[PDB]
RNA sequence: UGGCCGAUGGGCCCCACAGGGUUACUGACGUCAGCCAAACUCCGAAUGCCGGUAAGUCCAAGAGUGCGGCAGUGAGACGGCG
RNA sequence: GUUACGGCGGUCCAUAGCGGCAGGGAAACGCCCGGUCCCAUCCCGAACCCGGAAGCUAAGCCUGCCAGCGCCGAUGAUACUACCCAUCCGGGUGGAAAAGUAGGACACCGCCGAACAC
């Protein structure tokens, strides 16, 4: 598994502080700072528009190349700051990396299949905690369901995982769980 | 194997021992003219310090320890009247008469009652 | 140094601490030039009363 | 009908709302959920019909979540009292809500259903909401 | 309808009386505290209330030592 | 609020002194995570206040504190802030 | 001067605690041997105290290593707010958090006293 650069260009933010943040927030860049074993943290500004978009094309995880005056640099997203309302990002966070070191990701897993009549579905967990290489971040995950009955609880260390990467999350965590589907007496009683 | 499941006695009682000198170091409010006098006792010997808190630095101290004094084929009792005359007499040397007394988180009597008195009729007034 | 300082807005209706840092300055009426030295100070109390006058630099 | 069971004190003082809701900002538990616009009170009895609106036609698949709680009480002095004279009684419990709060949570299958239901409890609702996932 | 509360107590002004840095005279006082808010330090009295003042001419010095908060003076140099 | 082993509902279809909710329960603890509080704070500001120093208005505000003669007023309103 | 030693001390006293691992008895430290005499058990030499050094460092202590947990903590942003504003509606300058994040991290140091060396 291997991804592709999402080249962006960037530029040293001016200003620090409120006024320049919300200033360059109006204008529709987000303020971006990235930091580092480089022992030279240093902060940026970005295009809100073509952000978002890659955001969308590559998932909660995306490796990434930033233009810097010329300077390529590789660069891994951490945190973000999602606007309540507007949808909009405020603030993200990109941790300089290089290849060939071990880095620790948050991934998404997604359900599909086939559910009995009595199954139902519930999902505890949407993320778990993986380690692999920089060039092998994954973007989603998939679950198989056919014909489960009762109580199938499913472990989330029980999933088949690409090569390359470590379970982090310890083996007593739960992924997908199918308990017995409810009546009408069951959706009286509950609420109540 | 080995798995605890409690507390341990030796521990605690240093710990006890600490807390209960805790409460005169408290007061003790001793400068360069009235040092504080340590007294630490062992199961084998016995060891004073003469210090000015101000500085936490000592001024004279003896103990069991030193070759002449274990010299003396004597117990404790005979050996702490021996380094609590010491400590007089170095203490006169070094130029200081009236002193405070520490009890050393022990309880007066025994041992500690002979060195207070050695120093006592030393010359030590306290 | 020295500083040109003109009060340009009226002190009715003014924090009275604001009030006072204007007497310091001694501007009594609106649009009054006052000469005063460039220390921090005085710059601090341009800065705190800044919505009120205008300074104008000289030497 | 969610009402806490007890508290130290069965009333409390007007509020103050302003602020941007922090807590649990971003839908976690399921895969879909509703997100509030502006500051507004919502009623115990509000909540309970809009987890039926939401349950009742869902029916068999996915299981919902409820992100807030209704907790601080409230009191209305009844009618033909001249103000004053104490604090009233306790009538309804609300739970407050501040823009970009997430109300429900809901992890199902297919996405226009989702949508559906969580829209539904949108017009039930009292204040203003849209439909949010949790990608990043 | 009627209301059982409404009463009240008086208020008796509790609080650090002299900060930190003043110049203090013999026996003053130096706050009023309901629980062991502070500690005694060199030349600081417990009062018979948990109230603390000072025995010495100098200036009040606070400062935290052990995790804990303690009062002392530092006598002022002699012009 | 939603999950996890859950022995042991700290317990049940036959009570064996021994296998399973062989049975959908209860499940305690804790742990995964997500809110809330004027009488919760393992945290914590801009302000405001008190203390020291220095410049400035220093042909005086008509600045302060004390003492002395003098009366008013102790029915507030509104607007912005909490 | 060294030390794999003991006391007293410090410090906006956890970067200094907890957990696991390994190692110390020359001296000192602990445990330790027995209670005529001091002294004590609301009974007990458990605690203390006292006499002695036969034994051992397992416990405790110490030191060294481990990031399992505590723990400190950036830059940046966000919350917040002093002052001012425009016919509400939020911005301009000033101040700048909490939590989270890279990371840091398995204390440092003072005075005396003990064993090797001068
Ligand atoms: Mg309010
Ligand atoms: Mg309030
Ligand atoms: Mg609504
Ligand atoms: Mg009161
Ligand atoms: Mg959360
Ligand atoms: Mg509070
Ligand atoms: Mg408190
Ligand atoms: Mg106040
Ligand atoms: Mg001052
Ligand atoms: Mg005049
Ligand atoms: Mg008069
Ligand atoms: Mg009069
Ligand atoms: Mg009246
Ligand atoms: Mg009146
Ligand atoms: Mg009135
Ligand atoms: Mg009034
Ligand atoms: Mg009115
Ligand atoms: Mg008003
Ligand atoms: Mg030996
Ligand atoms: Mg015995
Ligand atoms: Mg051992
Ligand atoms: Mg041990
Ligand atoms: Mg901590
Ligand atoms: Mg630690
Ligand atoms: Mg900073
Ligand atoms: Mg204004
Ligand atoms: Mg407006
Ligand atoms: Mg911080």
């Not at chain 1, 995982?161 to 069951?186: F, K, R, T, W, Y």
């Not at chain 2, 520490?102 to 009597?109: I, L, P, S």
């Not at chain 3, 649009?31 to 005063?36: A, K």
């Not at chain 3, 220390?39 to 341009?46: C, E, K, M, S, Y």
């Amino acid at each position: 598994t291997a991804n592709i650069p999402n080249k962006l260009t960037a530029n040293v933010r001016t200003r620090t502080g409120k006024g320049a943040s919300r200033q360059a927030r109006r204008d529709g860049k987000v303020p971006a700072v990235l930091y580092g074993h480089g022992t030279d943290p240093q902060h940026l500004e970005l295009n809100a528009r073509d952000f978002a978009a890659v955001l969308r094309s590559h998932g909660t995880n995306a490796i990434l190349t930033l233009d810097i005056e010329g300077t390529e640099q590789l660069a891994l997203t951490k945190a973000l700051d999602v606007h309540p309302i507007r949808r909009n990002i405020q603030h993200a966070d990109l941790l300089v990396v290089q290849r060939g070191e071990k880095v620790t990701v948050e991934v998404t897993v997604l359900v599909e299949g086939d559910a009995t009549p009595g199954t139902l579905v519930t999902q505890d967990a949407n993320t778990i905690e993986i380690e692999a290489e920089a060039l092998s971040i994954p973007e989603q995950l998939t679950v198989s369901v056919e014909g489960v009955e009762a109580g199938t609880q499913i472990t989330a260390g029980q999933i088949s995982l690409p090569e390359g990467v470590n379970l982090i999350s310890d083996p007593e965590l739960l992924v997908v769980n199918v308990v017995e589907a409810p009546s009408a007496e069951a959706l009286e009683e509950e609420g109540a | 194997a080995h798995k605890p499941v409690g507390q341990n006695i030796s521990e605690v009682r240093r710990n006890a021992r600490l807390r209960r000198h805790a409460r005169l170091r408290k007061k003790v409010a001793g400068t360069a003219e009235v040092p504080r006098l340590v007294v630490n006792r062992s199961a084998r010997h016995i060891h004073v310090q003469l210090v000015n808190d101000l500085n936490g630095t000592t001024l004279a101290a003896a103990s069991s320890i030193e070759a002449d004094v274990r010299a003396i084929d004597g117990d404790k009792k005979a050996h702490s009247v021996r380094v609590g005359q010491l400590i007089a007499e170095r203490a006169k040397a070094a130029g200081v008469e009236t002193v405070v007394f520490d009890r050393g988180g022990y309880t007066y009597g025994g041992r500690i009652a002979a060195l207070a008195d050695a120093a006592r009729e030393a010359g030590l007034k306290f | 140094a020295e500083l040109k300082i003109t009060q340009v807005r009226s002190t009715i209706g003014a924090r009275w601490k604001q009030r006072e840092s204007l007497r310091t300055l001694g501007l009594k009426k609106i649009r009054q030039s006052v000469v005063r030295e460039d220390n921090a100070q005085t710059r601090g109390l341009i800065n705190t009363v800044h919505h009120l006058v205008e300074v104008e630099e000289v030497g | 009908m969610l009402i806490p069971r007890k508290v130290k004190h069965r009333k409390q003082h007007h509020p103050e709302q302003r602020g941007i809701a922090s807590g649990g900002t971003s839908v976690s538990f399921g895969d879909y959920g509703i997100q509030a616009l502006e500051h507004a009170y919502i009623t115990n009895r509000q909540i309970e019909s809009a987890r039926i609106a939401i349950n009742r036609h869902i029916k068999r698949g996915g299981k919902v979540w409820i992100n807030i709680f209704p907790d601080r009480p409230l009191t209305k002095k009844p009618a033909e009292t001249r103000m004053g004279s104490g604090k009233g009684s306790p009538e309804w419990w609300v739970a407050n809500v501040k823009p970009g709060r997430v109300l429900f949570e809901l992890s199902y299958p297919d996405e226009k259903t989702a949508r559906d239901a969580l829209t539904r409890a949108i017009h039930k609702l009292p204040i203003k909401a849209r439909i949010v996932t949790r990608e990043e | 309808s009627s209301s059982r509360n409404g009463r009240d107590s008086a208020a008796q002004r509790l609080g650090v009386k002299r900060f930190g840095g003043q110049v203090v005279k013999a026996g003053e006082i130096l706050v009023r505290q309901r629980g062991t808010h502070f500690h005694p330090g060199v030349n600081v009295g417990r009062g018979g209330d948990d109230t603390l003042f000072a025995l010495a001419p100098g200036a009040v010095e606070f400062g935290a030592k052990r995790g804990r908060k303690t009062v002392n003076i530092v006598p002022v140099a002699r012009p």
